[model samples]
Target chain A: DFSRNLYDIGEQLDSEDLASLKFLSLDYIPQRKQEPIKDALMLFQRLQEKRMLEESNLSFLKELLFRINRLDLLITYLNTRKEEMERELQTPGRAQISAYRVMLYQISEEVSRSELRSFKALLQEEISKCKLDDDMNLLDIFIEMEKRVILGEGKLDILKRVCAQINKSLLKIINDYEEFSK
Target chain B: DFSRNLYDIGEQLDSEDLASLKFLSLDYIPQRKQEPIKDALMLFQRLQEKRMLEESNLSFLKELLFRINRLDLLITYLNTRKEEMERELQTPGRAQISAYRVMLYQISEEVSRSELRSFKALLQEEISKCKLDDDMNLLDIFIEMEKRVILGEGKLDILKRVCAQINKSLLKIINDYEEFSK
Candidate 1:
C-alpha cells in the first residue's frame, strides 16, 4: 500500500513539480541517473533505491512536497499538515535535503536578475574568470565554488560576503546548516 | 610538459569546442562531476585523474581534438597528423573512445533536425513516452536506451532498424564498432 501510495503520488505530479523534486533531491541522487528520469513514479523509485524514501520514513517526500507547495498531497496521502511537518523539521536531523544543498537553493531563490551580476563578479578571482559566463546560474556557481574549495575548507565566507553585497537577508542562510527551519 | 601542452590546448578551445569535447568524453567522466567542469584545462585534469590522460597517452586527446577539428593541436602539441591518427585508430583496441559511445555519437551527427522528430517517435514505445520530449537529443536517447538495457543485448538491431528507415548510411556504423575505419 505504501509503494502504491508512492506510485499514485508520483502520477499526480506535473512536469514542473517533478523538476522541483529533482532539484531538491540533487545531492541524494547520483548524477548519472539524473538526466533520463522521466516521471514521479521513476523519481520515487530512485529515492527508494537510496533509502532516502521509505514506507516508514516519508520525511524526504514530505519536505519535497512541502517545498513545491503540494499541500494537498501532504495532507491527503502523507496525512501530515504543513505546521506539523515544519515543526518536526526543527527538532534535529529529521530533514533529508542536505543543509549544504538547502543553503545553495535558498541563496539562488533570493537572487534577483540584477543582483546575479554582482554575485558572478565576486567569484571570478577564485574560479577561472572565464568560467563565469552569462548563462551560469547561481546553483552552478555554488557547484563551481564547492569544486574549487571556495565553498569548501569548511567555510562559506565568499557566499556570505556575496550575500551581504546583494541580498543582506540571505546572510542568515550561509552559516552551518541553513534555513530548513523558520 | 604534457600537462602544460594540454593546458595550452585547453586555452585555445572556444566555448563550443569545449562543449563538444565534454559530449564526446561523456562516458569517461563521472555524472556528478560533469556540470561543474568549465574549460578544457579543468576537463583535462579530471581526465588525467582518471588515467584517461597521461604523458604517454595522447590518443584520447588526439581523438577529441580530431573530432572538434582542431587539427592544429593534434599536429602541434599531440605531434600527430590527422591522417596518421585516422590510420592508427584502425588497429584493434587502440581507440580510447568506447565503441558504444562512438555508435551513438555517430548516429547523432548523421541525423538531421527533421529526422530527430521521427527518431523520438520510434523510441516512445520502449522509453516512457513522456521521456521523449522535443528537447531531448539523440545522445540523451542513447543514455535512456543503455539504462533500460534496450541497447545492452549485444545487438543494436532496433538502432539498425531505426537507421534503416531514416538514414540507411547510419546502419553500417551500428555493429561492433563504427566509422572509426574506412
Candidate 2:
C-alpha cells in the first residue's frame, strides 16, 4: 500500500485537471451567453427613453434607411408602421390619438409631387362630398387627418380606413420608385 | 236788402265748401302716405328679423341665384364675399377666423372636378414645401384652407394670398364653365 510517487502524482494531476476542465466546458458556453447579452443590450437601447415605439421614431428609422440608400427597406418599414398605426386605430374604445401628426411625420421632403397629386385630388373631392353630405364623421376624419387633433374611437375607425387607403397607395408609389431605381 | 242777401249766401258757401275739401284732402293724403308705407313694408320683408345684411343671408342670396340657374351671378357674389373675408382677415388684431368654413360656404356642390384637382395638387405641393422650409405660417395656411380653424395674423397674410389665388382660379373655372354652358 506504499504510495507509488509517479502513479500517485499522475492520478492527482489527472483528477485535478479533469475538475478544472469542468469550468471550461468545451461546448463554447460564452457564445450562447454573449448572444443573450447582446440582445438585452439592443432592447435597452431601443426602448431606453420611451417605453413604446413612436411615430417620430419610426420616421427617424426611415431616415436612417434613406441615409443608407436603402429605399426599398424604407418602404417596407413604412408599410410595417402604417399597419401598426391602423391596428392601433381599430382598437375598441381607444383614447383619442393624433393621427394627423403621425401622417405628417411620414410625409418627408423627398416625397415627389407626382406621388401625391392624385391623392390630393381625391382628398379635395372627399372634402367637398363629405361637407355636402354633412357626414361629420368623414369631415372629422379629413380634419383630424390634416391637423394634430386627437381623434375619438369612432373617428379613428373612419380615419384608419380612409388614411390607410391613401398611405397604401402612397406605399405602392414608393415601391414603384424603388423598383425603378433598381 | 240786396247787400244783406249776397253776404249771407257767400258765407254759407264758404263754410260748406271748406268742410268738403278738407274731407277730400284727407283721402288724397292718406293715399300718398300709403305708397311709402308699402315700399318700406316690402323692404322689411326682404331683410326680416336680422335687420342688417349678415353673411348667412348673403349665402341665401347666392342660393337664390343658384335656384335661378345664374351661376355667373353666384360667382360674382362669391368673389365679393371672398374680398370681404380677406379684408376681415387683414384687419390688424383681427380675431383668428375660420377661412376654410368661409371658403366652404363659397364652394357649392356644383363645383367641377377639374378646377378642384389642379388646386388640390398645388395645395399638396405647397404643404410639403412649406413644411420642409419650416414655414409654420404657410403650413397654417394649408391646414386652415383645408378645414375650419382660427388663423393667427402671421398665418392670415399667407392664407389671404394663397386662398385668394385659389379662389381666383376657381372664379375663372366657374366663368369658363358658364360660358361653355351658354
Candidate 3:
C-alpha cells in the first residue's frame, strides 16, 4: 500500500521533477530527451501550473527554458526563486550537461559568423575587466560564458547560466525581427 | 581569312567568355551557365585584363558580375565605360533581359524578410519625398525599384539599376564581415 501510494504521488508530480528526483541515480526520463521547442514550452507551463515544484527540478526546468528559447523566463524564474534554488542551481546533472551540448549545437547553427567575431571581442573584454557576480547583468555574463563554451571550455555551471542569458537575448532579437517584419 | 581570324579571336578569349558571348542568343553558358562565385570572379578579372572589351560584351560581363556577387564592380565598370557603353546599356538585348531575370532570382534568394520590411518603409518615404535623380544614390534608388519589381511592378530599367545597388550593398556587408573577422 505504501509503495502504491508512492507511485501515485510520483504520478502527481511533474515528469521532469520525477526525473530530477531520480537524477542522482542517473536514470533520466527518456521521453524528455531533446523535446521539440513548442512541446517543451507547453510542458514547462504544465509543470508550473500547481507550484509543487522544488529545487531538485530547477535544472530540468531551466534546461527546458533554454531549449524552448525562453531564456528571459529562465532569468525571471531564477531571480524569483533565488533563495530556494541557489544550491540546486549549482548542482550539474545530465540535464545541465545535455542542455549545454544542445546550446552548442544551436550556437553552431544560428549565431552568424559576424556575431561570433563580435562575441569573441566582447568575451575578451569581459575577461580583462572581470567584475563581481552581483555587478554583471545575467545576460552579459551569459554571453561571455557562452563564448567560453564555444571555445571548448565546458564548465557546466557557467553553461547553465550562460545558455539562459543567450537564449533570452535571442528571444529579444527574434522579437525585434517580428516587430520589424510587421 | 575572316573566318580564320574569328577563330584566332575566339582562342584569345576565355572559353567561359566565349560561352558567355553566345550567352546573348540567351543560349546561356549552362552549369558553365551560372558558374561558381570564384569562377565568376576569375571571369570578371579576365574581362578587365585588356581594355579591348567592347560594349557588346557588357551584358555578359554584368551577368558574370551578378553571379560573382560583385555587382559593385559592375556599377563602377559601367560608370568608367559610360561613354562607350551608354547606348548599349539602354538597348535591352536578350542578354540584358536574361540578366534581369537572373538578378531577380538572386534578389529573391538573398533578401531577408526583415530587410524587405525596412526596404518597403524606405521606399515609401523615398516615393513620398520626391527626391530628384541627382539627389539619390543609385543604390538606394535601385533598392526601391527592386522592391517594386518584387511587388510585381516589372519596370526593366529600374530593375537594372536596383540589381546594381543591391549588389553593392551586399559587397559592403560582406566586406564588413571580413573586417570583423580580421
Candidate 4:
C-alpha cells in the first residue's frame, strides 16, 4: 500500500499551490443530472483553481480536474431538460429516472464546446468577487439564463445565481455518482 | 471504458452469493490496527463466504478479499503502536485512542469456532422467533462491543451512548480523509 505517499506529496507542495489545490478540493460541489445547478458552479470554481497548479510532479492532477469539468458539463446538459424529466420522475419515481439517465446520454452527445466555455466563465466573476452571497436575487437572475436556453425565450442573464447554481446541481450529481461507485 | 467488462462479470453472479457478498462488504469496519485477531476473524468471515461461490469466480474474488483482508491486518499491526506514538506526540488534546475498533476486532478474532456456531445459531433462532424491530438490543450490544476495545479500561456499561460520541471522532477522521481524497 502507498500508505505514506500522500504525506510525502503534501510536504512537496509550496504554500501557494497547496493553498489553491486545497481551496479547489475543499469547496468542490459535485454535479448530477437529476438535480439543480448551484452545486456545479461551485465545483467549476475549484476546477478553475486546480488548473493553476504549476508543479510538474502534480501535473496528473489536471486530468482529474478536467474529468470533473466534463462531468459538470454533462450535468448542465441534463439540467437543461430538468423540468420535464423531474416532473416525470416525481410522478413515477424510480421507474422514470432510470430511463431518464439513458436518455441523458444521447442528448449530451450533442453539446458544443463553445456552449461549455460559456458555462465555464459565467458567474465566475461574481464568485471571484464574492457577489452572490450579498443578494440571492442576483443568483435568481443567473438561474434564469439556463431557463432561457431551456425555454427558448428571453435574453441570457449570465451573472444571476442560476449559472453558479446549475454548476452546483451538476457538481452534486457527480459527487453522488462517485459515492455510488464506492 | 471497461464498464462492459464489469457488467458482464456482475451479470454472472448467483443471487445467494451476491447477497452474502453484500452482507460481508457492508459489515466491514475499516482498518484499526490494535486488534489484529479481530481483523483476522472478519477476514475469515469474508473469505469463507467467498468459497461458497462458483469455483470459477472464487479465485478472483478470493484474491481481492485476501488483499483487502491483508490491508486490514496491516492496519491492525500499525494500530498496536498507536498508544506509544500518541504518548510521544503528547499534546494534551492530541492524544488518541483507537480503543473501539481494536475491541471489535478482538471480539471478532477471539471468539472460538464453537462459540461462533452457537452465536450464529442463536442469532438465527432469535430472528425466526422475534420481530426484528423489537430486538433493538442487538445494535446496543454491538455498540457495547466497540466500547470494550476502543475505550479500553473504561466502564463498559456506558458503552452505547458514550461510544457513539467517540465513534463520531473516528468517523470524522474517515470523513476528513474522504474529503481530502475528493
* DockQ of all predictions against the true structure, Cα-based: 0.01, 0.02, 0.01, 0.01
Give candidate 4 regions above 4 Å deviation: A1-182, B1-100, B130-182
Ranking by lDDT: 1, 3, 2, 4
Provide the lowest-lDDT 10-residue window in model 4 chain B.
B95-104
Candidate 3 residue runs with Cα over 4 Å from true position:
A1-41, A45-56, A66-100, A103-110, A113-182, B2-14, B20-182
Candidate 1, RMSD to the unseen true structure: 25.7
Model 3 sits at an interface RMSD, in angstroms, of 24.7
TM-score of chain A of each: 0.58, 0.18, 0.24, 0.18
**What's the CA error at residue A83 for candidate 4, in Å?**
84
lDDT of 4 by residue, B39-107 (tens): 333333344454533334333234333322433322332222334443543454331222222222233
Model 1 CAPRI quality: incorrect
Error of 2 at A182 (Å): 69
Per-prediction interface RMSD in Å: 25.4, 23.2, 24.7, 28.7
Ranking by TM-score: 1, 3, 2, 4
Model 4: docking quality category = incorrect
User: How many times do residue backbones clash in model 3?
Assistant: 3
Per-residue C-alpha lDDT of model 1 across residues B1-182, encoded as one tens digit per residue:
77778888988898877766776786778547677998889999988899888988777888888876889987777778888978988776787776534543444454444444333232222223323443533433444555556553354555454444433334443432333223
